[PDB]
Symmetry: D3
Subunit: 234 residues, 6 copies
């Protein structure tokens, strides 16, 4: 029983790093993720990680309050660097080789995203954390996850949510799909990331796997080709 993927693009939503308070970053979750990612690295799986920032700031949210949307999005991107920073540290303290890259240059703190460098790091079994998403306002980290996934030629984009997967509707009667095609998602107007991102993933045939990052072992199951979450291909 060997893993089913060689290189993956793990997308961690920012809310996944929140404690009970539903804000900031929660050490315990980060520490557990480091252990789960550690296991994948040992399993020979190359891991690229795109991290969210919504647990701190959402540009759109700041804009409604009156702020210029672009500055709000810059803050949001910065927030992802903060999460990337905390995640990288959790990885290092777990003795996992990891490099934090940023689409927005932040000398000293981490390194600027570099495709060539990124590929070289992955081939050398370094966990590469991609922060600041796409580097542009008006986008989400989901778009960065798909863009970076395509860029590093990941076998799949693993979207870690707080739910088991894709449901017929936000789960009383709602059931969970095990597999879907981009066509069926759109057709039924199912909820799987932002349209710009999904569309991007579709046009490039980047398969997506929606799974629950709170269910311990879920991540491992997904890479081991075991029944877990929903697969989106076609």
């Amino acid at each position: 029983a060997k893993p089913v993927y060689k290189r993956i693009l793990l997308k961690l939503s920012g809310e996944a790093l929140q404690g009970t308070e539903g804000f900031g970053i929660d050490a315990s979750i980060l520490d557990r993720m480091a252990q789960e990612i550690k296991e994948l690295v040992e399993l020979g799986i190359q891991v690229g990680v795109v991290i969210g920032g919504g647990n701190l700031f959402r540009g759109a949210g700041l804009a409604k309050a009156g702020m210029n949307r672009v500055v709000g999005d810059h803050m949001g991107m910065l927030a992802t660097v903060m999460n990337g920073l905390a995640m990288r540290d959790a990885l290092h303290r777990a003795y996992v080789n990891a490099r934090l890259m940023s689409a927005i240059p932040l000398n000293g703190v981490c390194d600027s995203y570099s495709w060539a460098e990124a590929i070289s790091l992955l081939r050398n079994n370094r966990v590469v954390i991609l922060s600041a998403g796409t580097g542009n306002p008006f986008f989400t980290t989901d778009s960065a996850a798909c863009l970076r996934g395509i860029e590093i030629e990941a076998n799949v984009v693993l979207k870690a949510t707080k739910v088991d997967g894709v449901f017929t509707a936000d789960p009383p009667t709602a059931t969970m799909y095990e597999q879907l095609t981009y066509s069926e998602v759109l057709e039924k107007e199912l909820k799987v990331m932002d349209l710009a991102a999904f569309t991007l993933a579709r046009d490039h045939k980047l398969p997506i796997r929606v799974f629950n990052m709170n269910k311990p072992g879920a991540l491992r199951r997904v890479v081991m080709g075991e029944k877990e979450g929903t697969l989106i291909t076609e």
Copy 2:
């Protein structure tokens, strides 16, 4: 009326805490009000350098206790100040106030990299200069950056904006015996072991005779009072 400001150039240190205003994150309404108060100083001809905190988001020390490497915790803290500096600058722009955001740690694209020469030139041109990422080094606080930058830009005084009317004998929101002084010397702040800033900062401010006035920025118009020379906060001189 007829009165004129007592300072020509100041280093205003906006504490992160004071940017919270209930519920963490940033309180838009507070930022919007500060932009109006700073706007008034600019119009009054006062050159303003602003060092902003980040404790309303992250404190390295706090993150370290949770297990994180202290240096990475401080880097996050410094980044948090850039986030506040970003929000503050925007509030300034939307209030039609010319402002630049400089960062101790280069984050090119989102804001300027701190530059002393540039900073002086901007201040002389009546641009509000926001200094973020504090000193750029871990193991320090923005209070140290406020004193360092204040000395660097040759500010006439460092105005520490906080949530308390001044320098108390103990945290007023936790100790009912809390009492604040209206005047203190660098010395008295050493014998009375009073809290103003981390000794590292204070000492720097002392050796260079940089006066410090602590006031509450939650008090609308308090900053203006300070600048006009009216009874507000705690003055700390030699």
Copy 3:
């Protein structure tokens, strides 16, 4: 005469193709003419942001088919836009037009690194701002950058300068049935599956109600016609 421009700020997207003008490379005479036309807009008080293409030199997709890694192909394409931006800026300077070249990917020394705050400040100061390297990311086109930057700088409209009078029903130089519309809605450009820009861009322009006018830049004075509100090209609105 008596007429005034209908736009105060525009995002002009100069397609690489239109910079070819026979024989690949860049056609000096075309650049020189564009500088004169843009010069006129600046004098008319119109703030101009320019997103320039690179397909007259390299197209990532094209390089990929030849065997190159798509990402490196797109990086070359983006660099190609910087080359055009460089030539265009120079044409602007030699025409005595204040202009800045910003690049999505920092190439410090040769040109400025794109900065939103800086860009707005330059536009307000009547500086022509040239945006190169498009969005800075592979898998996108400059058309996406034109829409993104247009939204970013709050342009009143995106003017797509091409080699055809407007949005045809098919490539006019290859299909004799080719016909262009004078008006279309984001919707009609979806039902009629008409070609304007990559859906990625268009969609962005739609969600933000950024109007788009496609015109031929090979037509001397066509840009001026657009800006003055005269019949030219294809207008795409909501």
Copy 4:
């Protein structure tokens, strides 16, 4: 029969990468060069590569058309980065470790030229591609080839041209020299790169070898000390 050089500075003229049309970049040529350079790397030869840009833009040429010479030269230098980019990729797809450096910082795309880094890469058998020449206008990549050659202490500068070597005149009667001294080149006013470059190579005793990059195996022959092209020393 082992190679005769340990570290070399390979100078590829921009026109060498042009297809039949005599413009842009031709995949096939790049792909073949990657194979030839691959062989040198395996032979233990450390390779530094200075690439031209004249197959895209020549500052002087742009200036005559009316452009400011400095901007024309900046475009020319950028053109070399484009070639460096394509060449590096050809190297990677041929499974050859290679790093593209630039005298003009281009964050993300490639790395900024760094002498220390360059030496370290060469010692680690990484092909180092130097683009943007000297970084200054009013110079040619030939000057960069000599400057970088001296900098990395290359044993020789291999100037790859479309000709077998140095002739008595641009080859009907013209014959090819097998060896020359800097003195004889100047004396007879022979055509071997720009004066600024040649002079630089002379003052530092940087030997030069002019050879035909279109003649398959020529490069290998030159490094194997076999009769090929012209040698310039003294």
Copy 5:
């Protein structure tokens, strides 16, 4: 007899690199230091080096002459980069893997200080040279030595002076202490670096060892836990 420290922060004062003239940099001293540091690296000791600049420029000194103190300090910091440059080279010519980092970004010349990178280099037995001190005016390299020492979690800060150690007064009757506590230093107003630095080292319990860098083998003795110089702890 194995060494007593694993990672150290070696602080070289700028005057230690001066020749007889008492100015500039003296090759011979640099060459000897490279040999002594080489030995530590081979002994498995991870070495971080903070270098001074007072052998070239002191901001305070330039200020008295009329210059703006900040610009004077920038020159002073630059001076440390010059020493760092010369020291790194001495290390490379002695075949010691070394990287020069700077708190003030100096593209091409060396690398910008990076904590993560620094730790990674030390773990890989690379001598890391930290120049431009803290990067801020109004500080000394002694403060940088303590700050960087704490940052890289060095076991001790070795302050190399022109004296055997800490004396009761600048050595006729003055005697040398073998061990002191931060409290006794302050209490007796003993001379051990700047207050800002010492205080910093104290608050973090960073032990300090003052020793003579001119006494050949002194450095080795200190790392071998042999009687040498003064220890400052508590």
Copy 6:
């Protein structure tokens, strides 16, 4: 009186040696005087670009003989020019002269990164532009940078400021037969094998017809004499 400068834009190359003035390091009083002389040129409407040497601190070649790798020696030399550029800029600021320090090798924070477009814009705005780190490449001297930058900014002339009245037949402080010419052609400087600059530089200046005037900057007012067209130093033209 009634006289006007003969140059509109010059490239002033301040040799490191001339910054020594007894005892190595920099002589504050010399820097202060130069600031006053340059101040006068700026007021006279003359645009000034300044390329500064570093030999008063480090010479790569010199360091190499001692055993250091030549490239690292040259990097130190270039850094030395940044140190002089820093001191010179400050002397200019304290003399109330608008000045920018640009460096061939980016040292962001302490000074601007050299930028041709920026440089021209600064000169046109009467800012003294100081160019440090010479050409940015090892194996060259600041004399080459002076000629290169001079050509780049289209200076009317390169003024080589040294410690000798002009171009002598041999080092005047070591050879008593030393004699200087008042006029020379690029050719004569080749047949007479006279010393002005490294052939690499000179040749560049020749091919572009960049005139060169060598004068002593230890002579108070000599720079002004040159600019006013009065007998001073050695003129080297075609």
